[PDB]
C-alpha cells in the first residue's frame, strides 16, 4: 500500500536535450496527483504503490519517447523509514 | 519495446526473515518467462518493457509479504539497449 | 575537480542501533567545511572531487564501527556538472 | 576493513564514445590486483575497504579524463550479511 519511490533519468543519445527530456519527465510528473519532491540527484514521489509503478512506468515511456537510450535508477520504498523529510520548503 | 530491468530487494529485517523474502523473490523471478541472471548486488531481467515493470510489480508484492519494511534499489534501461549479451562484451 | 556525491547508508540493523549509525554519519558530515542538503533518500554534498571522495570514505568508515554490516549506495557526478542550486531549479 | 564494491559509470554521452570510456574504466581496474566481475549494469570488486576507495577514485578519475561528464552509480558494501564473496558464481 504505503510506498515512495526516488526517480532518477539519464538520457544518453544528445546532448542537452538532455535537461529537455527529463524536464519532459518533470512536467509528466507535475501533471499526475501525486506527492513528490525534485531534489538534485532524483525527483521523489509518494503515494500508493499501486499509482507509483503507474506513475513511474509512463515516466520511463515519455522519457523513451524523446531519447533512443533513456537509463534510469530508482529506489522503491514501503514503511519505517522516512516521508517527514518530504518537507520540501526550499 | 525492449528493457533491461537490475532488481535488487534489501529488506530491513533481521536475520532469518529476510534471507525468506530474498529467496522468495527470487523463486517467484524465475516463475516469469523472461531471462534471468543472478549477480552478486542485483539479478538482471531482460524483456519486454511492459513485461518487466509487471514483474517488477509483483516481486515487489511478494517481498513486501514477507518483510514489513523493503527497500529496493532498481535500474531500468529502455529503448534501443544493447542486450546482455553485447553488454556482456564491453 | 568540481564534483557532487548524493550519500545513501543502509544499516542492515534492528531499530534504535541503526538510527544511530545514520545520525552518526550525518553529524561527522555536518563537521566537514563542504556544502551539504540532506533530502529524503540520500544526502547530496557538494565540493571538490579530492575532499568528497576524503569525505566519503570517512562518512563510511563513521558508519560502519556502529554497524557491523553496512551498505551504501553513492552517485558521484564529476566534471562540467551543474552546481546544487543550477540543479535545483533545472 | 573487509568491503565489496560494485562500479557503473555513465557517461551520458552520444553512442560509440560511451562503451569507450566504460572500457577504458574497465581496462584501468583490471590493472589493479583485485577481485573483479563484471555484470550487465556493474562491474562488482572485493577486498579491503582501503584498496577499493582508492581504486574507484581512480577509476572515475579515468572516466572523467575521457568525457566532460560523467556520472557513476556506486554500491558500498561492509559486512557478511549479504555474503558477496559467493561470487565465485560469475
Keep these: 500500500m504505503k510506498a515512495s519511490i ?4 539519464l538520457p544518453l543519445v544528445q546532448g542537452i ?8 519527465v518533470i512536467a509528466y510528473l507535475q501533471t ?8 538534485p ?7 500508493e504503490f499501486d499509482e507509483l509503478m ?7 515511456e515519455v522519457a523513451g519517447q524523446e ?5 534510469a535508477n530508482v529506489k522503491i ?5 522516512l516521508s517527514i523529510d518530504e518537507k520540501l520548503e526550499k
Tied chains: 1, 2, 3, 4.
Excluded: Y
Design 41 to 47: 540527484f532524483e525527483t521523489v514521489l509518494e503515494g
Design 32 to 39: 499526475q496527483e501525486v506527492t513528490m519532491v525534485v531534489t
Design 6 to 9: 526516488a526517480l532518477q533519468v
Design 67 to 71: 531519447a533512443d537510450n533513456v537509463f
Design 17 to 24: 536535450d538532455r535537461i529537455a527530456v527529463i524536464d519532459q
Design 54 to 60: 503507474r506513475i513511474l512506468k509512463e515516466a520511463l
Design 77 to 81: 520504498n514501503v514503511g519505517e523509514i
